[model samples]
Structures are given as structure tokens and as C-alpha cells.
Target chain A: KKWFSEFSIMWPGQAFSLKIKKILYETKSKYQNVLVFESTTYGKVLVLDGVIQLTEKDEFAYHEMMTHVPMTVSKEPKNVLVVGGGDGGIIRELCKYKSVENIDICEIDETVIEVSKIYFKNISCGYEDKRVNVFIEDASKFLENVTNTYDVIIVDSSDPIGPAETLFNQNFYEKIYNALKPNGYCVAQCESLWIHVGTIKNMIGYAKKLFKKVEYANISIPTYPCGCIGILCCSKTDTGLTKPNKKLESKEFADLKYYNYENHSAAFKLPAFLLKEIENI
Target chain B: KKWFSEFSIMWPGQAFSLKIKKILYETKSKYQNVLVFESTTYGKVLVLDGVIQLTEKDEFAYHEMMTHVPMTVSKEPKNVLVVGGGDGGIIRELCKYKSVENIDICEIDETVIEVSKIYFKNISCGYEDKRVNVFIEDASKFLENVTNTYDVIIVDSSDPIGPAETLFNQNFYEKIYNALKPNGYCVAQCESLWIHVGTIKNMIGYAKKLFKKVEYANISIPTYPCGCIGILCCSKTDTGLTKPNKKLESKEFADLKYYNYENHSAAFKLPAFLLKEIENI
Candidate 1:
């Protein structure tokens, strides 16, 4: 009955602590520290470098929104690439699209990928799919030479600290823009508006420098530090990213846990105070 | 370096912990246990019966949304009643409106009122206003006889566990409907859509039987469990509770921290899964 605590490296002041039923695994990977633990209510949790990556209970909220938002925002995204998605939740969500033929996930840490396959099997299930290709390489370096490859890219990195620090900067976004084909869209994990409005503003500004349009989505996942996370979707096309370009089949619609047409539009709607902060940026 | 951890009675299996700067005050009230403390990041916090009531850091998100949403939704609320709001945050928010004339707050616990008055000067400042009448009594009983009186009734009670248990029932909704004038609206603190969607569903169903129109709002408050909460708004009149009826002066608009016209509309937009649960409820 001891506790597994994480005083976040990303968020300085607040810390999230979970009651530990048992410690499942712990390791120091080449890139970062990895820990998987069985939590009382959260089911199971994965931690990287003293920061919470995901908990089983609320992982659907994040994975579903992260993948579906960009998938729907873009018109029939056939091939998709995910950056820094070591956990494979993004890959699994990406595999759900019948239109998506190829799913490429570039993750820096190999241990994270291995651990997820063992511990978070459901999340890492996309690894079992034949169309999915795994790259255990840094995403920034991988995209250095690549151009006009994927129709949509989903960046499922953790909070912008440690390994993810580079992902939030302008250079990485430049590479991501070059990697995407024309009329393409990319959605990246931006931090919460409540905590990281300044970062969000800066990222939006960087995206605006290259992309034709930018839209932000606020997704609620209770296990996350603030019970919410934000993702920014930027498009190379003239079309806005707020509405679904392609409709979901009845089977596909029934499979969704969070994303819907109305919810997709509502996600871009920011609070009044936050709208003021993100106005010009 | 000691942590003031709260194993919440309201939420089982998850606990929200704060860094303890210092314990300001601790005492058992007539109805519940009251604890006031200064947090390193969240500032001063008020806890009643092991659940967080409000923190100085994010109180504005709750107070502003709770008051302004109803204030703007209803057509110039002149007389307003607050039920179970001992902290006086709602009263202070209501005092911001120039059109509002009378304010009445009914609190069951006098200790909560006293603690807030001493620890929270800005929040309790509404008590000093001549228009605000303090009623240190149970609102459920008080509301039984009150009919055709107030334009808006704001229920700012805690989680529906012990003392606030009666507030969530069908009888309370009936009483709230009776107390309101024609074209009047009432907003009550329903729990989170994340954690308490079932509770929200029942409450909405209850309000629907009595009120002509009913709506629900999903509020993001980090200090609270799940980093979010919900409120139910029911209208006796045919006017929709989504849009702001009255135009806010530039000076009045500047005072708001979170509640904007767009944000007010966005707050009611629930996630796809939550919308499914609340669909028929």
C-alpha cells in the first residue's frame, strides 16, 4: 500500500500521486527512465522520466482524440505518421481507419516500445498489424531528409520536458511541415491552456509561419495532471481543421469513445481568457 | 516538505494532494470538519470533510462560470438566491452585476461562512454589500416555502454525500423550480461528467420533469477531483439557457477571468461518450 508519486518535471508546482497496488516494472532506458505500475483505480500506468505518460483508465480519451481529430480533420487520410509515440496508443487508434493504408510510428526510445508491447498490450496492438511500420529512431532526425510522404501526422509526445523539449520548438515543426504532403494536416500534443498558454501561443505562431491554417483541440483525460490536454492541428490545405472533411461509417462512428462531429467543432472553442492569450499568436 | 494529501470521500481510489506551505486553521464544525491551509502553488485552500471546497488559485474558474453563465443566460436577473454557498464566492460574483439588486445566501454551516470571511477577504466581500442578506439556515427547508420569489437560484453545495445529500434528489429540484419566478433559471452544482455522469443524468432527468427546459455545463476546475465539475441549469421559461441574454459592458466584460459568451456556449458541449450517457437521461 505504498504510493508511486510523480512530481512532474514539466509542471513545477503540482504533483500527481497514485496508490500503488504493485510495481510491475522499472528500468532506465538509454533515452529515459521507464516505470510501469498497477494502480488501484487507474488500472495500470506508464511513467517516463518521472512524468506520467498514460494510465489505462483514461488512455482512451487521449488516444481516441489525438488520432481521430487529425484523421477526421483531413479528408480521407490514407497514410499517417506518428512522432514520439513509443506507447503505440496512437498507432492503435490510427489502425482503426479503413482508409489509412500505412501507419508509421517513429519513437526514440526502444525500451518504451518494448515495455508497451509487454505491459500495455491493448495500447500497443497496432504493432501486431501488418500495415504498421515501427522506427526506433529520433523523429526529428528521421524527418530531416523525408519530404511529401504522409497525408497526416500525429505527434503523440509526452509533456515538453526532457526528450520532448525539442518537439515544442520551431525547428522540429519545420521538419514536420516538410515531411507532410500537400493538402496535409498534422496534430501535435500541446500542453493544457490552463498551464501552458504561452507555449501554446508560441507553437501556434510557429505553425502559422508554414501551415495554411491552425486549429487547437482541448481533450479531457482525467488521469492527466490537469484532467485535460490540448493538441494543435495545422493544415497545408486551404480547408479549416475544425470540421470533419470525411464522414465516419456507422461501424466507425460506433467504435469512437470521444470524438464526434459536434465535439470536434467544440474542441477548438477556447475559453474567453485563453482566447485573449491566443488571439494574435 | 510535508504533503497535505486528501483521500477524498467524494471520489474513491484517487486523491488530490497539495504541497503544504502551512496549516492555517483546523477545526470541527457543527455539520462537518473544516480545514484551511496555504498551498505552495495553489495558494490558500478550504477543505470541508476531507474534500476541497475552493482554492485561491482556480476559484475564479468556478465562481465566474457558476455566476456569469446563469447571469448571462437569464434575462437580467435582479434578485438571486444562493443555496449551500457558505464560502460567499458566488455572492461576490453576483455582486459584480450592476443590474442585480438583491442577493440572498443560505448556508447550513456558520463555520464555513466565518472561515471564508477571515481567510478569503475578496470572496466574502459580498457579505459587506447592503443588498446581500445572510441566511444561516438549511436551504432545502427554506426553499420549501419560498415560491415566485427569485429570478435565479444558484446551488453551490459540495459533493452529494453527507449533508448535501438532499440537494441531489427530485424533491429539491421541485422546490428550486417552485422558488423561481416565471422566466427564471436555476443552476446547481452537479458533479463531473467524467466521474459523475450517472449523477448528472439523474439530475437532468429530475429537472426535466419540473422545468420546461434543462441544460448541463461541464466546468474545468483543477483542484476538484477529475480536474472538472458539472452544473445543471433548468429554465422555467422557454428562453434557451445557452446564449447570454444581456450584453456585457466593456468594463463588466474586463472583470471576467473565464466566462466569455463563446466559452459559455462551449461549456455545455460534452464529449461523445458523455453525450451518449446524458442523451436520454
Candidate 2:
């Protein structure tokens, strides 16, 4: 790779390259390859197993959509669980909800958290909040042992590769379905709709069998595989997912930069092509 | 350029690269360097002025959003004018509206049109329609001499560089305002909101001076500079731009691959960061 290292996927025939100003840190943890770098425009970027996990500039688009959509759709998300967000962006968005009392995060690799806390403090600042509880363990095992049901569960995972492969399958979704309260909602970070429609279709099929409601939402981030990514949101109840059961106060709106009331519904508005492709599943 | 041709804006610090299958055609026109290549995945790729104009695979996302939004917002668009779409993708989408009678296109470069007609038949097929009238001249001068007003005007231009520089200026917008009917609507292809919000803000400021209503809409295309592009829609009257004045029937939905009634409003739901940035304007 040159000074400008490019990250791309061949299935969708897309590439995202960044001009590197300097390499902040790089290592190989037991779970995956961890690298943190400072780029000219995207600020700080974290890469896991050669995939872009998050960029400091546009991480809010994914984190806000992942957290707020389920939190708002459910009546009030009090006890929440994040599956694999070691970078802390998801927990940062979770902290915005004043009603949430207990927030638990289970990250597989402790090195990721240690690296992020030093290099990505702006995103990892959620660790400072008292509501958050950190656990270093495999997410599937963590879900199997959990006794308390959560109002919302967010699977803020990387691409379905290496350690995260099982997270995208049926068995993990089954555990998540059982761990959620009766009216609880769950959302997972599926890959790009442009790149992984077939993967999304298979995962949605798995989700529909276990939940009463299954829907797909998307957000635009230039750093993603196709510059856009999808979220699989499934609800335990039959309440419609288009309208949020709880709305944020005007004061709370200041904390968010990407998601809001109208955008929540807008994220569910798939293009005609995507709608037709995913309609059967 | 290397085997992996990198497309990026230095300020945005983002780039998209493609593996070249072969260079199908490349030439320097009087206006800009026009090149066509066969990519490993994206089929026939067209680049003008060192900017990607369209790829054979994903041009629909941009063309459909640019044409349908303006057509649907206007109550009944009979006469429509396309300013700089030499590839005919915009006119292809305009032909979908059976209510549209007269379609006029003014492109500055004849070589771009000739090359496209030979190399890109799928996109250039719109010229075969009986409603289309083509002119090989500058758009600014062409609009200055026009006596008749159109119901819709589409500025299907390239980036603001070389020959297309004047198309993004305030004087051209004023000319378009004069060439439109009393209740006419016009849509222009603005660059990415992610990369060109300042540019979009300035263009919207110019449009607000001439039109009663000015709004911005966006569509996601991975081939674009920032994976997203914005459209500036300005109305002569205060008809709501979010909801289509004339909805597409079920029969017409079959023809569209990217656009629909639900996504029309989805395009206007800007992210909170963008809303705050453009709120004052």
C-alpha cells in the first residue's frame, strides 16, 4: 500500500481510500487486527481486521441511528445492552437518553477498548458515564448467561467476518430475541445494502421467524463499504416501527447530529429497487 | 494515473478507486478530457473533465432522482428543458412521464453526445423518443434566446469546472427563472452535500433570491465523489416540494428502479448536522 492506503470490497466493486497523515497506533489483538490512524479529513479512524470500524468525523450517523431508533421505537429503553461496540460511539449515543438507567456493553477484546480510550477519547468518552457497565467477553456467551431482560439490545458489530461471523447468523439472533423484554426492540449493524443485499435478505429471513416485526433501516456514511449501511431492526411486539412510541424533547435534540424524529421514519423508506429486492424476505 | 485510478477531492480527504478492465475510448475535447473505459465490474464508465459523469451500472440512482422529483412536484409538466445532459439519462427519465409532451436538451459539446450515442446505448436511448429536441450549443446562450417558457427545467450538468462553470452561477439561475412558466419548477444537479455543503449553501442562497421556494434533495450513489449527491429544487410558487403534486400510479412504479412516492420525501429529510448548517440560509 502507498501512503494513501485504500480499503475496498470486490463483491460490490467499491473502494474507499484515505490520505494518511500518520499512523497513530497498530497492533494485532487476540481477536482481530487493530489499527488506529490519523487521516487528513476523516480525523481518527479505527480499522479492525482490515475493515473500517469507525471514523471520528462520520461515526455519529451510524451510532445515532443504531441507538435512537430502537430506544425511541420502544416506549422507554431503561435497561440496554450493546453487543460489540468497543469504540464507545454507540454507548455515547445511548447516554443521550435520560430515561435509560442501566447500559451494559460486552466487547470481545479488551485491547480494542484500551486502544480506543487513549486514541479515540471523543468517541470513547461514554465510558466516563456512571450508567455504563463494561464487560469483556464473547457476546454470544454474554447473552446466554444474562438473566435480566433488556428494553433494547444493540449489536454494534463489525462486518460479518472473523470473530463477528456468528453474530450475523440465526442462533445469535435467537439469543437476542429471548434476551429482550416482551415489548423490547433489537437493532444490528448489517453491511451495506448496496454490497450485501443477499446477506441482508438471509438475515432478515432469520429475524422474521423469531420476531413479530422485522424491518431494515439505512444511513449514509462515506466511510462505509458502499458509502451507506443498513440496520436490521426487529421488535418483539406487533407495534409499528415507523412511528416512535417515545419522542425526544426539544432539549434532547441538541445532543444528536445525525438522527431526529423525521429521519427515524425516513431511514425506513427504502428505495424501490431495495424494497423489491428485500420484499420476499 | 496508475492501474487503480483514484478519484478524490483533497479537501474532503476521501477517494474512490476502480480497477480498469481496459480503456475503451479516451480523447481530449475542446471543453474537457472525455474518456470511456470498461471496468472490471461497473461496465462502461464515463469520465469528463477528470470527474465521473456516469457508470453504466448505477447511473439510474442519479438520473431518476434528478428528473422525477421536479416532474412530480410540478402539477403537470408539459414542456421540460434539460440544460447539459449529453448522455441522455435525464431525458430517459423524463420520457417516463406520459404527460410530458415537449423535451428539449442543450449540450455544449457535440463530441460528448456522439461518443455517448455509440458507446452507451442503454442510457442514450432517450434520444429516440419523438418528444426530444436536441441542440448543440451553449446552454446559457440557448436560454437567453428562448421566447417560450417551460413547465420544468432540469440543469443536468457536470461539476462546476471548465465548460460547465457558468451553469452553476447566479446569472444562469436567473435565466432559468425567466425561462420557466409562472408556476414552473427547476432542478439542478448540485454536488455532494457531504463535500459541498458550502457550495450547496451558496447555490441555495442564489436560488432563494429568484424563486419563492428553494429546497435540497439527496440520493446515494457509491460512484459519486462522496457517495451522495444533492439536487437543488426551486419552485416559482409555494407548492410543497416534499409531497409530490402528482403521484405516480401503480403502473408507472414498475418502470422505476430507484425512485418512488415514499422516497421523494425521504430525499428531503436532511441529517441534523446538515439541517443546522443550512438552517440559517
Candidate 3:
């Protein structure tokens, strides 16, 4: 058996590879391909649809940025919704906020949850929390009738391909807009700025038509495409997404390894090359 | 023949690999093992001592941040010196500044330069400029008996191993400080904070005792270890390194694909995890 493996074609000519020590689990769900491997250095590794979703060593960088950036910026987040996060990493980070009373997770494939529960207990343990609820369905269809509005909604989907392709269109973003409260904010994994600038530009255009304010931010994840990933945040009103209204005590963020007030501010400032490409939108 | 290759053990179990179309040149210089290859997506790549130094695609991101940050900060950079940048990417960027009268580059290994000239014409063309001069000597030894002082010094070195290991110590930093004119600044590649925080911490400690103003900055390069690398900037005076006093006209940077005034400020803002690690120093 080969000890080293490489995966992912989403980024085209380029790929992100890792050294696999052993295969922990492998399954093919009706929705997509799934695999859990114990990596040599990154500890546990998760891959879906041939793309690296997360690694134990760097998952905090992604989950914390996805959850804290929007959760902290909104004024007193109480009810939160996470779409398509089957691995439970999003809710795991969301559980850190005491102000969040409820977290609704909608994952289309139940096998992703089951595999994560059996093999990645550290990431999937959030399901044990009383405020957490799971609804197994297509996130777009589930959001169409979301009568219980949320203070913040997180779209933690895979790359803009295969099962998650519909999530990138204006229709799904429109559904997300309607699911939010008056001052609600939504943050989604918007792929890589290096490889998915067109997708990002199109999504920004879609978001601008539906939301009053839209912004983009990024964080470094060594296992992701181009070694980095982007985040898109949109607000229902003209509430700018640069500053956080609610402040956290040091103890409040003691559980986090990466996200904090300083990172939240720095993430929104784009580099010149990228800023020139997406600033007008 | 193997069409794909990976290099660099700087991150231990994790590695940054690239798809190679063909090996343009391969040789063992007196100082290190040097190889140049044509990559599918990254164009040409240069590796030293089994570690990647630069790739044609993203070399600008590393070279720009290494040169412009200190050059723009030093007010009027008349005379500049580059240590360990035999490939000439640093000199290429340095030549863009019309105000610079003399640019001296000291690289210990002559074979690295010979190979670069033969295989990397675009990167090595800066050697033909009238203002730039090359000296074949150990940078540390050459700096000890320097006859001229420079307003800006850039240490564009490989990882602190083998020939470059001496460049990261207190003795070499002291020599660099002495080689610079008063108010001058030096920027050295400081590896990755994610994988080499101890080295960064140690280098920061060494820099503090020598220079008045010591700071760190970073840039993203997918080919580098951990997908990110750091720069250590030390100024002879207490002049702040965050903002540049000498501003560039739009035409001055017309040929640049990455560096700009905005990126100069953004580069200094480290993520919260790194900030918390380096703040007290």
C-alpha cells in the first residue's frame, strides 16, 4: 500500500497532498465520497469529494474564523444556524459562545455525521450539547421554510462543486438572506482567492443584489488549496462587517487556538493584488 | 522518470510538493545542492539543499515583501546591499527604484549564480543592470570588513540550515547592524512562524539586543514550507517600520504584480496566535 497520498482536483493543475500513516475509515455516501485517515503529522484528516476539508492540526484556524468572525460581529448572537457542516466543526466552535442559546445544523448526508462521530470524536462532540439540533436535509430546501429566524447563519460547505454547487448560486444566497433576522449576518467558506476569484466575484455580485452590505475575509490553512481559504460575510442591513460590537473577555476565548479580536479586524483587509480584483464589487 | 517531485524537510512530516515537467539544471555547488526544474503551474523552480528557495509563479510575493518593506521605510535608500540572494529576484525588484545609486549582492556560492544565469534568464537578468554588482564571499565575513555602509540591507536567504545557518545567529545580525548606515534597516527571511516559532522567538531575542527597532512581517507563498514565511526587520534607529516615509508614484510600481503601499502596512499585522507569541518582545 502507498504510504503517501495526494488528493483534490477542485483547484485544477495544483493539488494539496499529505502523508497518510493509516486509513481510519472510508465510505461512499449517496451524496459524495468520504474518507477519514490518521495523518503522520496533522493527526486526523478528513476528505470529501477528493478535497481536503480539514486537518486536526489546522481545523481550528478554519472553524474559529468561520464561527467567531460573524458571531462576534453581530450584536448579541442568540440563535445561530449552520448549513451543510456535517463534520460538526462549525457547531463545535459555536458552542463556545455562552450567548448562543441554540445552534441548528443541516447536513444532507447522514453518513458524514456518522463517520465523524465514530472516527473524529474531538470534532463531532458538539452534538452532545443541549442547544445543538441536527436536521438531515438539503440545506437549500431546508432554508426555504426556516420560520425560526437566526441571529447568524453559517454556510460551511465544501468547494463550489458537486453537491455544494447549488449553494453558491443567488437562489441559495437569497434563501439565506430571508432566513436571517433584521440585523443578521451570514458567513460562508468562499473557496480560495487564488483559484476561485471568478466564483468569488460572481458570489459577491449575487450577494450585493440581495444584501445591503457584503464583505470578504481570509485565513491561512496549510492543508487547503493554495494554502489559504476565503470567507464571505453579508449583512441584511447596512451594518458594516469590519468591527465587532460585542467584546469577549480573555477567558471567553480561552478555548480558541486562532480567532480573536485582532484577527477578526486583520482578516477583512485584503492584499493589493486581491483588493484590485474584488474591491469595486 | 518521475514527473512530480517534492522538497524541503523544514516542516518535518508536512511537505510542499510541485509537479515537475523536466529538470532544467542539477548540480552540487561547493556550498549546497542546487537544482532548477520546470514546473507545470509554477514555471521555473529553484531549490537549494533540498529545500525550495523560489518558484517563478509566486517568487514576486516573497521577493517584493523582502525588498520593498525595508527600502520604502528608510526614507532615501541610496545604497543597498543584499545578502545570500544569488538568484537576482531581490536585485530585479531593487533596480526598479530609480533613487538607488548602488546595489551590491554578496553570495558565497558562485555555482548557484552560474546555474541561475543558464536556466533562469528572467530572474537573473538583474545582474546585467549597471547599478548592481556581485561579490563572491561569505556574507558574514564580507560584512565584517565592509568599506561602505548601506541605507538598506536585505538578507534573502534560504532556511537556516547548512550554508545559511550562520546568517540567523547573533554574530551575523551584529555584523549586519554594523554594515548598515545609521537609521538603516535590514530585512531577513525568518522561516515560518507556524513551524519555527522557537527560531523566530530566538532570532527576535537576538535582534532586540542589537537594533533599536525590531519587528516581524509575513507573506504567503504556496511553495514555501507551511505555505507562509516571515521576515525580520531591524532598524538602527527607533523609526517605526509599519509605515513607509518614501512613497512611490503609481508609475514607479507599474511593473509590480504584488507590492503596494497598502500591503506594506498589512504585512506587519500578524494573526492573533502569532501576535500573542511575539507581542511582549
Docking class of 1: medium
Model 1 regions more than 4 Å off? B237-239
lDDT of 1 by residue, A1-281 (tens): 88777686466567667888999999988878898999987889999888888998788889888888788777777889999989899988888787788888888898999999999998898899898988888787888955438989899997776777778888998999888888788999988877778888999999999999888878888777777898888898777688886666657457677777777777887766777787876
Tens digit per residue, CA lDDT, model 3, B1-281: 24444544667666566777888888888889888888877788898888888888888888888988988888788999999999999998899898899999999998888888888888888899899989999898999988999999999887777888779888998899889898789998996867777889889989999899889988877788777888998987787577887666757577676777866877777766777777677
What lDDT is reached at residue A185 by model 2? 86
Which order, best to worst by DockQ?
A: 2, 1, 3
Clashes per prediction? 0, 0, 0
Candidate 2 chain B: worst-modelled 10 consecutive residues by lDDT: B1-10
Winner by DockQ between candidate 3 and candidate 1: 1
Off by over 4 Å in 2: A1-12, A250-252, B1-12, B250-253
Clash pairs (backbone) in predicted model 1: none
Say which prediction, candidate 1 or candidate 2, comes out ahead on lDDT: 2
Model 3 spans > 4 angstroms off: A1-4, A279-281, B279-281
Instruction: Tell me how far the alpha carbon of residue A266 in candidate 3 is from the true structure, in angstroms, after superposition.
Output: 1.5
Provide the lDDT at B133 for model 2: 94
TM for every model, in the order presented, reads 0.95, 0.97, 0.95
